[PDB]
Symmetry: D2
Subunit: 394 residues, 4 copies
């Protein structure tokens, strides 16, 4: 059978706004920071890592094509450790954790790091006609960030597919704005109570007034009221719209990682771990309805884990859009109180490549806060996919 | 225990030159072409695939961040099938096959496609300052292609690391120029004898004189002689150089894929498969000496396989540079007559993201040609890694 | 002999900061605004213009290569009127007035408009390798604004040539900072007293809070003290520097124009004019010492006008850098109280293409304010030239 | 009265094709080459020039904003000589000669150089959003070359205005294709008989096979036949088109200049001059019908000269398009045998900024060949203008 996978430690950066506090920090620099910190938290030497896998979507510079390896080397991992970068769009952060856990499951490693890093502020523009020239006539600089946010089959913004899901699953504008407001209020309460303090790695963000610590998710609106969302206009469709900038996730920069070990290696070392991996699952859906990808994925994961929806104490389902997050919770029969108890993409931000690993850290630290047992981590994926994993607090 | 993985079908495109026959075919276009073909050759319904994994390094357009999912859908694979894009630099092609095989080993799927697709001719230029502006002073147009060919730690071209490998392991200029010539002559013989016909998928390359079929690797030199390589000057160092444009691999475009099944699912379908997966391994090395990555990876793969170097009847060890290929064969004690019997990167080309899956097709089709048992597939990886897999003809 | 040239009317925009209030107004849009306004002020029909000449240096868009014609047509001038764009770097605004006055002098026209328009905020970046491609290796986006500010022979910033002039003519740092401070104080007093109100054409600058009138030169610092300039560091040389951002002119956007007529046409119409043209002169100097170009140019103009330095009641000599503005006033023996009585480039800004015509408007309105008789307008020119003109209040 | 202006010397480069022999020679390079030559041919010290004026439209690099001053200095003209760059679109070349002649007419100088220089192959692409950023969404790479060929009011290609001129003045496709063929045959005859030898300055164009002299206009078709033009399709309109790539001028690179002196200064130096300036004129017309600009300009020039159309022994009327050239000759009543006797824009090419000074050299050298008296030089101007000058052989 497959070896049991133990998550011993995890960390994330605070989530920077588009063009915000982390705009000057490359994805490989952010990746290396979290790599070094999860090693310290796990009490694991950099020379004892079997594998490193990182999620990452939008290459910002040539270094990013070496992202996992640069994060590992510059994070203190010995050069004998293999490093892999994976891209499953917004599921990449969780895919990296799954892929790294697979090396432990199959016996290829006893220690593996899974994380994700993304800086969308530094997303580049490309010039397709630069290498061989344009000769005559205007050309274009292609926004690679917005291009990533476009379905590659119908060439529509991800927000259009959110309208398809809202229309198909009866998600009203009022319901979307209700989730968006509650998300900000939840994240604001978490920040005020310090629920993220232990899981966040402060970053010193060199300013002209001196070095200041960036350690709080800056997308959150702490004074949000219902009218703040009702006044906004739809942004992705010109007719019968419901998805606004207020009930859509943000564009952000961040990194996160977890350190995993085989159960035997965790016993022998005597670590006090966060959680163990129970199961994971994938799913594909209609690209035009990608927002409900988490629904099947989550159903297969519960089947694999032999669990039910009522057994989930904590649920981290990324709020890409309130339109799809409502449909996901509605289709699975989840309790909105247990789903994203401290906010999510709408309030804290959506650093696409790192989100999957970022909200895994959130789920595991929330289990420790409430003494819960099981946590579900799931998110939708552009192109029409879903990914889900279940962890057990131990 | 882990499930046994069977390779039932495989195919590759002809390798196009930089700015050559496939310059107008995007990576997703090439990816879908090979996805549909592996399904046909294996006689597998697109509704019966459990996972698709594609290796790919240099994003040429937004669509490329969805490459695996676009190649699958447009290749005829149902939308319920998950799709993953992996980046392990030049090992990406073989990593995609490994990652796909792992879904079968772990019981997450009983059918999986693994391949790679790269079009370096379409490699873009980026403008890091385009999003938020430059304000004042000249900015740069970054060559993402050349940037991908630079070690991210010392910012040196991969050819510089090839010189380090030559100096450390005593590979002479005459030794490099010998392998380069032979590689070209082995490929010319292979194309003359038609050894590549079955494994290659032709592509109609819409010319102004009518449609013509591109089905022959165009980087080969059929009239090569020893003088053809001696006259060239070193390219990557100003002093005591040995790597030239002739003894170094080319910059090429191509795609390839293989369809794999569980041993039970292949038994149940009556498919006549190519080979079965014996073992795989990864390794990390000094980034400055990334060229000898295949050595520890090949040794580890043989340990897992319980085999020796002398049991390998076919070896596809990518000729990234003659400097490192000679050292690889040298340090492993391989028979050069069994290594790259029909050429490799120097002669056929190096479509980095697709090479790993491309030479796997070669190795398996060569095993059927000579009636052999075991084949090794290995290649070096920028940043200091190596990957290796062993297959058994059946 | 040559016909006498009468300046009947003139106007300028307020001077916008780099990336400031006029950043959204193209050079042709600003040019057309002033063209229409000088026609109204002169009581001249757009169908009665013999010639239009505009100064302009940095093309921001294709339209700018048609600048004079677009400003004329869109300004209300009939299509039967010829339009010319001239480029003498920072002397272009005054060159346009000279060139237009020449058509009257030679009898080719009885009515001509001379002005200048420049928006340096909208200065573009070029891609020299875009048309025919780069193939491989990084390229560059060329800052055309900074390129304009570089001597084309030694490829040094204009500020380096200002250091050459300060060194050769004994202009201390303290003296440069003394002129810079006094310039801001003079411009602030002029703004507070309303000396520019009549000569400025307000522009409604569409903001999200509503439409607000832009009618005040926004580069001026109204609370400047001596320490504000002493604390600044040299900006153009690494050793023995004196030229700072504080004692150097600004980079700005603006437009200006004057309407001129033959003396006979002015008599017949019965206009109440601003001034008449007395003489003009050009000069070339060492490019490395371009800052003292005004010295000879001004000497030849006084010779042509048969006047002396003591006969000048008003002097508008552009403050490109305090380094050269001090040397100019020192070499000519001018009274600093009569030179730039209401500030200049350092405080009000330097919209290079429009500056020449802009400060002509300033000089003529200042003559009316003090009841003076003669005004000198001169400025230095990158590449090593000077230009000067003398007007008489009538 | 006004002083008499004498043309003592002139020279032009061979006209290079778009991306042809002069693609590597910047406009300032070509400008300096012709400046030095006119000085030599006239035997005038570079210390004795009073003004330099150059026409130039499309800035290819920062240096081009200094074009007149760079061509002068690097051409051997002393640094005390002022230098001016003028832009009247395709009339820039003749405008530079007019502006230079005006310095002599007004007594500001007794020696002046007037020319033009354009390299459209090096015409750049701009990024208007590069300075302050795009933030989100695709931006454009603006073709400054094609943009310069667009009317700035209706944003239509100049060829569209040629269709308007053809429709309004009844110029048939067969009439346009006839002028195009003849223009090519006249040029071929001129090159065969060596008519251009004296007036052309050869340029060694550093090739990989050794240096070769580029001294022959390369846009001409020496084997042209009526069928060569009938087979081409209209290029600028989808319906009822008549302007083709064959009957329209080309996109070319070249430079030219002339050295002029006051009649008294030429008398005092014993120079044997080419011709003297009789008169010049400007005109404005409907931008949509800019092609007939030469008609009112030529009529006005003849009035000032006190001459008739029948006194003109040579006419260089630029063939911007056969559609407008036919109408120009038609509305003026000119003898097509006297118009462009050795070809023009269609056959020889159209280096827009240099054309005006280029065909002036042609007209004067043709007057010496046929022993004639009066020559007319005229051309249309984008945006709706025309310029014309008359010279007298002496
Ligand atoms: C929706 C989207 C296009 C908005 O882009 P944006 O304009 O840059 O968003 P911003 O927050 O910077 O500003 C939007 C405006 O709404 C306002 N706004 C946003 N959220 C608000 C809130 N909760 N309350 C009140 N106002 C709000 C902003 O203040 C801002 O107003 P301003 O311009 O006057 O300052 C972008 O955020 C987006 O695409 N999000 C989803 C991305 C995605 O596809 N993720 C993955 C999908 S699987
Ligand atoms: C080496 C490299 C820089 C050469 O770039 P290139 O100039 O575009 O290569 P080209 O084949 O187009 O031209 C090189 C010249 O050598 C010549 N040449 C190359 N191979 C030759 C041969 N076997 N015999 C004779 N001449 C040869 C070419 O004809 C060409 O000459 P030409 O310009 O007169 O036509 C590039 O191919 C490279 O980077 N290779 C290694 C890439 C890499 O890092 N792969 C991954 C490493 S793990
Ligand atoms: C000198 C130059 C390079 C400065 O560029 P800049 O950095 O964009 O100038 P800015 O005003 O935007 O900012 C410079 C800094 O000096 C400070 N500064 C400028 N003038 C100041 C003053 N009078 N008092 C106090 N501080 C001042 C600014 O506040 C700013 O500080 P900050 O960054 O903390 O906000 C540029 O203005 C220049 O080149 N000027 C001359 C151009 C020229 O060649 N003209 C034609 C020559 S013939
Ligand atoms: C008309 C125009 C758009 C053509 O652009 P182009 O495609 O680059 O021109 P090219 O000569 O390179 O190619 C055109 C095609 O027609 C053909 N052609 C052109 N002239 C021909 C002739 N006299 N006989 C036969 N064929 C001819 C070319 O061979 C070429 O065919 P190919 O591609 O198979 O080789 C461009 O030249 C133009 O804009 N001309 C007018 C410019 C202008 O506005 N000047 C100022 C106006 S005041």
């Amino acid at each position: 059978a497959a070896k049991e996978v133990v998550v011993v430690s995890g960390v994330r950066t605070a989530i920077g706004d588009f063009g915000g506090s982390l705009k000057d920090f490359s994805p490989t620099d952010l990746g290396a920071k979290v790599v070094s910190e999860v090693l310290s938290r796990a009490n694991v030497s950099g020379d004892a890592v079997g594998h490193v896998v990182f999620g990452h979507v939008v290459n910002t510079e040539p270094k990013d094509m070496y992202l996992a390896r640069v994060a590992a080397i510059n994070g203190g991992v010995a050069q004998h450790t293999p490093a892999l970068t994976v891209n499953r769009l917004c599921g990449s952060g969780l895919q990296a954790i799954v892929s790294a856990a697979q090396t432990i499951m199959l016996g290829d490693a006893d220690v593996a790091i899974g994380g994700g890093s993304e800086n969308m502020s530094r997303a580049p523009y490309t010039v397709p006609s630069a290498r061989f020239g344009q000769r005559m006539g205007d050309a274009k600089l292609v926004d690679m960030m917005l291009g990533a946010l476009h379905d590659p089959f119908q060439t529509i913004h991800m927000g259009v597919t959110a309208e398809n899901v809202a229309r198909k699953y009866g998600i009203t504008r009022d319901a979307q704005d209700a989730l968006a407001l509650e998300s900000h209020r939840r994240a604001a309460r978490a920040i005020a109570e310090g629920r993220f303090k232990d899981q966040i790695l402060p970053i010193s963000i060199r300013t002209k007034k001196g070095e200041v610590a960036f350690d709080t998710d800056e997308h959150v609106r702490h004074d949000a009221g219902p009218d703040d969302f009702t006044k906004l206009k739809p942004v992705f469709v010109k007719e019968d719209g419901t998805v606004t900038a207020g009930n859509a996730s943000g564009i952000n920069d961040a990194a996160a990682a977890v350190l995993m070990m085989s159960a035997d290696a965790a016993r022998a070392q005597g670590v006090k771990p966060l959680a163990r991996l129970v199961a994971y699952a994938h799913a594909g859906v209609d690209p035009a309805y990608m927002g409900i990808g988490p629904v099947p994925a989550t159903q297969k994961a519960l089947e694999r884990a032999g669990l039910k929806i009522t057994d989930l104490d904590v649920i981290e389902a990324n709020e890409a859009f309130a339109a799809q997050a409502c449909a996901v919770t509605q289709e699975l029969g989840l309790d909105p109180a247990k789903v994203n108890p401290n906010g999510s993409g709408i309030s804290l931000g959506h650093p696409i490549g790192a989100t999957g690993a970022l909200i895994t850290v959130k789920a595991l630290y929330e289990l420790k806060r409430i003494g819960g047992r099981y946590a579900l981590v799931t998110m939708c994926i552009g192109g029409g996919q879903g990914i889900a994993a279940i962890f057990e607090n131990i």
